[PDB]
Design a protein around this ligand. Structure first.
Ligand SMILES: CCCCCC/C=C\CCCCCCCCCC(=O)O
Length: 133
């Protein structure tokens, strides 16, 4: 299952190309401006086989709970209603969100003890690096 090294609290320390990623998602300017300033914490926890990913920031909080391989309904931080799934691949915790004929992926992987989230929509790739705190 998911590595226990994911469990805990993570703080954003770097974000590359997030504005264009939000644009690709259809997020408007005022929201993007606040999204570009946000430096969330992400809390990953488990209970049994249910994993929870909670994001906290001044602007927006989100939370998803899921079992690996089992599709679920999600509310995103930009207020999309998606059909989502999280699965593993080579230890990477990989999320797909689908809505309205569109798709985005968020792949969260451990790299030298940092959590790296790669976020792809259309051609746009955004990389967000988190430190464990
Ligand atoms: C919830 C805090 C970060 C987002 C703040 C701006 C809100 C809405 C715009 C849409 C953002 C959707 C992507 C959220 C980030 C996913 C990748 C990550 O966990 O780093």
């Amino acid at each position: 299952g998911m590595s226990n090294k994911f469990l805990g609290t993570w703080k954003l320390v770097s974000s590359e190309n997030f504005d264009d990623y939000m644009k690709a998602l259809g997020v408007g300017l005022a929201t993007r401006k606040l999204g570009n300033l946000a430096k969330p914490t992400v809390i990953i926890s488990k209970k049994g086989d249910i994993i929870t990913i909670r994001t906290e920031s001044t602007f927006k909080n989100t939370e998803i709970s899921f079992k690996l391989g089992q599709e679920f309904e999600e509310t995103t931080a930009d207020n999309r209603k998606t059909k989502s799934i999280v699965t593993l691949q080579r230890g990477s915790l990989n999320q797909v969100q689908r809505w309205d004929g569109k798709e985005t992926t968020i792949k969260r992987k451990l790299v030298n003890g940092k959590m790296v989230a790669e976020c792809k929509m259309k051609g746009v790739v955004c990389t967000r690096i988190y430190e464990k705190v």
